[PDB]
Paper text:
Tt121933-236 crystallized in two different crystal forms; the higher resolution form, at 1.85 Å resolution in spacegroup P21, has four molecules in the asymmetric unit, arranged as a dimer of dimers. The CSS score for both interfaces was 1.0, suggesting that Tt121933-236 forms a dimer in solution. The monomer-monomer interface is dominated by the helix-helix interaction across the non-crystallographic 2-fold symmetry axis. Tt121933-236 forms a more complex fold topology than XcpW and the related T2SS pseudopilins, with two main differences. Second, Tt121933-236 contains a long loop, from residue 184 in β10 to 221 in β11, which folds back over the external surface of the conserved sheet (marked in orange in Figs4c & d). Tt121933-236 is also stabilized by two disulphide bonds, between β2/β3, and β4/β5; both lie within the variable β-sheet.
Type IV pili (T4P)1 are long, surface-exposed filaments which extend from the surfaces of bacterial cells. T4P are composed of both major and minor pilin components, although major pilins comprise the majority of the pilin subunits within each fibre. We identified a cluster of type IV pilin-like genes within the T. thermophilus HB8 genome, using the program PilFind. Three of the remaining six, TTHA1218, TTHA1219 and TTHA1222, yielded crystals of truncated forms which enabled us to solve their structures (designated here as Tt121836-123, Tt121933-236 and Tt122238-123).
Author numbering:
A (entry chain B): 42 to 235
B (entry chain A): 43 to 97, 101 to 236
The structure:
């Protein structure tokens, strides 16, 4: 609980709902993961079925894309239509003001091993390549608080699934600036990529 | 602003959920319960595998209302289940949610009144094309903020008004206030 924790929970509900659908009834490129020291990027595509997803409203039987990235302390989102469309991530989700997003990490689970590396998933009639069963997403954010907060250790509040470690996620340190910090790790199943 | 961003995130969560109300459902799909003191909405839909994590071939319910300065959500499983709102979405502490309102669009006319939507194989009764949702929230801010007028920042569609929504006043208590109006299309309730 806490205002910032509640905002991170909202953010996770938005991203999880969107990413669960990636690959849905799709042939071709379904996911691209672009981890970097500056923040990770994730793009995904899926086929729209009428009635299921709001953004599909005008794209029945058509491919849609989705993308998330962090830039200048803000997590941003974009959406597009068309096979292989490049989302432009210009819609604010969280941060870039009082709230600073200090880390955004995405790892993936392939055959029981967690990885964080450049990766593209292609769905072929024979199957997915590689087979990705889940994504792990991590956010660290900070905000000012009158009187300061004690120094926060990223990773200290997480419950990891089997095989996932702070070392893989490359969690940053926290600058000694008195700000209130909160973090969130969440796992999103990706049955359409598996 | 930070509070505006928190209202945007909340709107996204609610929209994505309410858009699915009525999906492949026969029977009661939606109940709207407005009041001058705050609105409630409940809805039901069929779960199809691979649509959502929480979901196969079973009816689910979903509900929202404000209680004690928090917008809360509830869920249930089963035909006719009551989704008792039991978890905070936004507010209930530093953030206070002061108003939640839901209106509906029926044949070109925006309405806000007690209403249930029923779905039959032939179609919906009444035929609801969209919902409009409104939130007002406040937070403390060092140095205070000026007096806010609810409705003052909204872009309304034609026929939707502050009077229709029964928007409240705001006290001149120095808290920072923000509001959001958003429209959710409801094609499953329009067929």
């Amino acid at each position: 609980r806490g205002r910032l924790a509640d905002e991170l929970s909202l953010t996770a509900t938005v991203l999880a709902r969107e990413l669960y659908t990636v690959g849905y009834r799709l042939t071709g490129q379904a996911l691209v993961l672009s981890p970097s020291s500056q923040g990770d990027g994730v793009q995904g595509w899926f086929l729209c079925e009428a009635g299921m997803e709001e953004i599909c409203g005008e794209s029945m039987g058509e491919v849609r894309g989705t993308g998330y990235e962090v830039n200048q302390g803000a997590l941003r989102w974009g959406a597009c239509k068309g096979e292989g469309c490049a989302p432009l991530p210009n819609n604010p989700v969280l941060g870039g003001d009082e709230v600073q997003v200090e880390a955004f990490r995405v790892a993936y689970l392939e055959g029981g091993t967690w990885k964080r590396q450049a990766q593209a998933v292609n769905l072929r009639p024979e199957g997915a390549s590689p087979k990705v069963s889940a994504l792990a997403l991590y956010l660290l954010a900070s905000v000012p608080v009158r009187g300061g907060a004690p120094a926060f250790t990223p990773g200290s509040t997480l419950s990891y699934p089997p095989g996932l470690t702070s070392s893989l996620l490359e969690l940053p340190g926290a600058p000694n600036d008195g700000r209130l910090r909160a973090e969130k790790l969440w796992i999103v199943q990706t049955p359409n990529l598996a």
